[PDB]
Structures are given as structure tokens and as C-alpha cells.
């Protein structure tokens, strides 16, 4: 009777995406998830899976799945992967080394750029330490680069921690916006609750 497909369109077809520093997470459970139709839903620039074989993803089951989504620029999609470094991986969104899941990305230049420029997608430029896997930093505290405290005011060695992307339609592809959805599969000592059609559960 569990003929309710998992609400993937809610995440993938969301009209607005989050900035990478404030990346969104959607909890998906208690439904059927076929990933073939995902890999056939549109033309994705990136569709990489780690930890489990992308051939028979449908024959697998998990406790629940988490769909994180955000926008970055093209040249940074490579940082959404295990063992990566860079401003995005270090300060914005970090995947673990033993990641088991899939990274899906597509070009959103038609949606997220505009003539004159869209500057409202931001990324974190400064942080005192690197993010642990899947942690999230939404703070806007002035970054104290030096020995003198900032008192919430920008100055030399006192920098606002976020910076705009400049998304214009004619940008080089490396500087065009890309929408990214990361699928994490949680394998917990508990009954499965997300299952593909092709598993013997169904």
C-alpha cells in the first residue's frame, strides 16, 4: 500500500535554493524511492555516487535519507566530494571521507543569474576552523583576523564573513550558478523506512 513515491520534486524542483553557507536539509522517510527516474528526470551535469554501486541503487534500503541543497558556482562542484578542500569544503559544506550517498548537480544559469547580476547567493569566506562533516555555519559575526577585537564593526583585520557570488548570464561556465542536491543515506540499527522498488522488500 506504500505506493507514495518519495517527494524528490519538492527538493529538486524548489523554486528557490539556499545559499551554500545556509544550506538546506530535507528529511525524507516512509516512502518508495526509485533512483532510475532521478537519473532520468533531467540532464544533470554531475551525478556521482559514493559507498554503494550506482548500478543497483534501487535494490537498497535505508532508515531514512537526507537531501541537502544549495547553490555554488561551477568550478566549485568538484569540492562537493570526499577528501576535498577549498573555501566551500572547508567553510561551507563538508562531506566525510567515508561518505555513502550521491552528489547531484545541474547548471541553473537560466534561474539563478539575471541581467545586471544576482548577488544574493553568498558563501562564507572566513572561518577560524574547518567544518566537520555535515555541520553548518550561519553566523554573521565579524571575523577577527588580527589581535585587536572587532566589536561588531568592520575595519582592518575585521571582515564580514560572507561574500556574494556575482551571477550574470554571460559569465564563464566556471562562474555560473549550479544547483546541488546531496543525498545522504542513513544506515542505523533500526528498521528500514526508505526502500527502492527493486528490493525484495517490495
Amino acid at each position, epitope marked *: 500500500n506504500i505506493t507514495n513515491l518519495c517527494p524528490f520534486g519538492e527538493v529538486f524542483n524548489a523554486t528557490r535554493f539556499a545559499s551554500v553557507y545556509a544550506w538546506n536539509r530535507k528529511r525524507i522517510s516512509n516512502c518508495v524511492a526509485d533512483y532510475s527516474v532521478l537519473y532520468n528526470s533531467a540532464s544533470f551535469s554531475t551525478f556521482k555516487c559514493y559507498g554503494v554501486s550506482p548500478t543497483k541503487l534501487n535494490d537498497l534500503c535505508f532508515t531514512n535519507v537526507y537531501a541537502d541543497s544549495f547553490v555554488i*558556482r561551477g568550478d566549485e562542484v568538484r569540492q562537493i566530494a570526499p577528501g576535498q578542500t577549498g573555501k566551500i569544503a572547508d567553510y561551507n559544506y563538508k562531506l566525510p571521507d567515508d561518505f555513502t550517498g550521491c552528489v547531484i548537480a545541474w547548471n541553473s544559469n537560466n534561474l539563478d543569474s539575471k541581467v545586471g*547580476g544576482n*548577488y544574493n547567493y*553568498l558563501y562564507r569566506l572566513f572561518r577560524k576552523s574547518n567544518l566537520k562533516p555535515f555541520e553548518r555555519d550561519i553566523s554573521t559575526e565579524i571575523y577577527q583576523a588580527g589581535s585587536t577585537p572587532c566589536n561588531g564593526v568592520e575595519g582592518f583585520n575585521c571582515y*564580514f564573513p*560572507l561574500q*556574494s557570488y*556575482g551571477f550574470q548570464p554571460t559569465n564563464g561556465v566556471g562562474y555560473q550558478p549550479y544547483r546541488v542536491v546531496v543525498l545522504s543515506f542513513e544506515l542505523l540499527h533500526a528498521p528500514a523506512t526508505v526502500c527502492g522498488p527493486g528490493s525484495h522488500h517490495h
Partner: antibody
Amino acid sequence: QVQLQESGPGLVKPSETLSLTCSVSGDSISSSDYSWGWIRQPPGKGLEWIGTIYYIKNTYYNPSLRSRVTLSVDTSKNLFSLKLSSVTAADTAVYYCARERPPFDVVVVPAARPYNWFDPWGLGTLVIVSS
Amino acid sequence: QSVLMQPPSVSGAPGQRVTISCTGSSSNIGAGYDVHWYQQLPGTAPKLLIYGNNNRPSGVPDRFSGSKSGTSASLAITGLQADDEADYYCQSYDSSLSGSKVFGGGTKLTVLG
């Protein structure tokens, strides 16, 4: 319409401090949208950014001049000011003030600062450094 | 001395097309930062000509256009008129060290007479 008017001493002796004042008309220097900047131009040469002040207290300086530059805002007179210490002959220039605005439709103004441009500009005031 | 490199002079006959380049590096124009152009008529203050690579403020005629590509940007002026003789400056942002606005060295445009 926004207009900016510079004012300062025309001549200053070397090692003194140059004090300049820019009066703003048609807008408030207490803006949380616009910033207020100083640019200079040595006679017959190019333009050089000095520094910018935003929302009364936030400052951004040309790194090669930062140790000599002080910017401030006076909300009661709707003006902002530049002080340049220990002037030498290299500081003889026309000094312009300008409004520095962010791109249109920006929610988080401080995050868009690298994409700001200058508009409008003041008339500029010539400062000669000589003893 | 300027971080953005412009040709010192460009010239064209009345009615011709003319371009002024502005080459930076991977720490300014190549890092994704916008290029703005200011026009300085002789004896006058600079004035905004192009903002955000290719946008015209109100009052700037159709004949002025801007673009950017890689580490470079370009100002194009079609239908050259005597009114256009001026010095043109590009300007961007450079993220190296603590970050700073940077200007080109300026280009004197001459309308051949």
C-alpha cells in the same frame, strides 16, 4: 539627485595632516545601503582609491595607505571626512569624494562590497603639499 | 602604477568603432569581480559610464558598451563623436592580501581631427 561637495585647505606643508570634508545633499550619510568613499588623482596621472566608510562606523582602506588614513562621519552635518597624516609631495592630488553603492536588489549589503561602484562623484578639490 | 592594465591611448575617426581593453589577473577580474568604467571629460571629475561589466546607467548613450572575458574586460564605443574625447578608467576589486578596489591606468581616447 545626490550631490557631494568637497572642501579642504588647498595647501598643506609636508609632514602635516590633510583634513578634508565632503558634504552630502539629497541623501543621508546614515544610510545602511550606500557607502562613502575617497579617491584621488595626482595631476596628469590616474585614479587611486583611498578608503570608504559605511554605516557610520565600518571602514575599508587602501592597504598601501591604511596606516595614514582616518575616515569618519558626522550625522549632524550630513558629511563624512578624510584625514591623511604625514603628507609628502606624493600626496599632491585632486581629492574626490563619491557615493559608493552596491548592486541593485542586494539583501546583504556588506557581502556585496567587492561589486560596489562609485556614483555620483563630487567636484574634487586640489591639494598641493609644499613647504 | 596601477593593477589593471589599459592602453595609454586609443584613437578613431568620427563615426568609427573603438575598443579599450582592461586586463587584470586571477586575483581581480579573473576572480569573478565586476568591472566598472568611468569617463573623465577634460577639466571635470570622473563619472560612471558602465557598471557591473555591461550595464549602462541612465543618461549614458547606447553607443557605449562593456563586456568581460576571463581576466580581461572591454569598453566599446560605436559612432565616435567629438563629445567622446576623454580619459576612460576601468575599476574592479582585487582579493589579494586584505582586498582593495583597483583602477586601470586610464586611456586617453582621441577622436581624430
